[PDB]
Structure formats: C-alpha cells, structure tokens
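WARN  no MSA supplied for this record, continuing single-sequence
INFO  ligand: 56Z
INFO  echoing inputs
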Amino acid sequence: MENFQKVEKIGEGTYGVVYKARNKLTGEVVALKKIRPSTAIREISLLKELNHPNIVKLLDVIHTENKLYLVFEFLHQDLKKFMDASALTGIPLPLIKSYLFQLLQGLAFCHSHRVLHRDLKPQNLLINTEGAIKLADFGLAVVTLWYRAPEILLGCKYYSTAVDIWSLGCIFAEMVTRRALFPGDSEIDQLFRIFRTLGTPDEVVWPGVTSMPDYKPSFPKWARQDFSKVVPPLDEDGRSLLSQMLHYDPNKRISAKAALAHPFFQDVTKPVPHLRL
Ligand SMILES: COc1ccc(C(=O)c2sc(Nc3ccc(S(N)(=O)=O)cc3)nc2N)cc1
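INFO  complex generated
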C-alpha cells in the first residue's frame, strides 16, 4: 500500500504474502498480509475483537483495489526459526512447557468464542523477547500437512476445535524431540505415518471411523507403537498429556481448557528465551 513501506517479505500462505512493514505516517512496525467475499471479510472483521495475550492482534482490515490487506502487530520471530536455531541443544523443557501452556490458553480463548484456527504450525506461532508466544494467521472457514488432524485427512466435512488440539500436540512433540512427529509428504503418506505410530484406527477407539468419506477398508492395519519410543525425552506427565491431545476420536481428544488443568503444568513458569534477532 501507499501508506506502508515494505521492509522485507517475511512469509507466504496459500492465499497471501506477509511483509514486515512500516506505517509511513505513525512509524509503527507491523506485519502486513496482502491477499489478491463480503461474508469472509465479515468473518475477518470479527477476528479484530479477539483480544488475548496469546493471540496476535489484528489491527486493521482494508479492502481496496481488488486486494485485501490485514495489518497485524509485529512479532520478531516464529517458532520454526526458533526451533531450527535451537536444534543442536534443544529448547529447554521449562520453555517448551511455557509455550505449550500459553498456546493452550490462546486456544481455550478462541474456542470459547467459537473460533477455530485450522492450520496451526510452527510458522504461525510467533514469539517475542519477553517469553510470550502467540497464535497467528488464523484460517477461515507446498502446503505442510504435518500437523493435520486425522479427521480432516479422512474427509470430515465439519471441523471441530479438536483439530487445533491435534496440531498443537504434534508441535509439542516436535519441540521435545527436535524432529517432526508425522512428516508426511502427501495426504495418504501423512495419514499412514499417523497410523504407523498410533495404530490404524478402528471402530473400538474411533466409533464411526470406518464410515468416514475417505476411509478405505483396504487401509493397512498397523499396531500402535509404544508411546515411550515416540517422545523419549518427555516425562510421564508430558506423555500422558500428549496422548490425550492425540486421541483419534475428536470427541475423546482433550480440550484446551481441560489440558490447562493437566498435572504436566503443575510447575509451569515463564522463562525468557535466548533470541537471536
Ligand atoms: C504463514 O503465514 C503467515 C501470515 C501472517 C503472520 C503474522 O501475523 C506475523 S509474521 C510476524 N513476524 C515475523 C515472522 C517470522 C520471522 S522469522 N521467519 O522467524 O525471521 C520474523 C518475524 N509477525 C506477525 N504478526 C505469520 C505467518
């Protein structure tokens, strides 16, 4: 826009490009998403009133010249970069726990307001120097499939808040192990990597699963792998919480509110991360 001076391109989505920009008038530094539907913009305009310390603030929405611009408060680094920067040593557990706890608070908040994110991934989890982490780039009603809930992969038409809990569980596992939990390269490979680790779901653990749009009786039948092998460095409270975030049945999957009460968070604190900007 004319009112903004692009500083640098900082990312892209399957619908828009995000720039670090400076308000030529106020000088405020922001994240500006450019997108090339009044019902959607109404859904967007609503996100503006979503104020929570763990949700990136949407400052303005401008529809002009066949372009939709979303102006957000700017954070200095995303979790993917932080994880890559911390790959040799690993993010300390207290910080992992703090981040998970904060993201659950953000989700408990949007979910109580009937807002789903739908596409959580390290690249849209933003951190600052003060130890906070916030949910960014909410999704509206080469793409990464690594954090996709099984019900989405199986063709469910209606998503529930449980899809965000699944994504956050995959991210939690990744911070702990320093390796993506389910790194699929195709929808079926994604689905099958999930099955190989958690076991091929059936009617016992997931009532209705065999009646899902994309379920095939011909899916291979893999046995559930021992959880202690999945995220070895994680203590039992962490593994217990993770298993509840990764339940196959959306209705059995733990809620963000309930997860916040899990014993894993008994000793949660808010450490300062070492950020190289
Ligand atoms: C995938 O699509 C997205 C669309 C929009 C947003 C968004 O709201 C952002 S991105 C941002 N700053 C930032 C992001 C990454 C880095 S990095 N890579 O660590 O050097 C540094 C700064 N601040 C806000 N508020 C995030 C993702």
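The chain is about 30% helix and 15% strand.
INFO  checksum written, moving to next record
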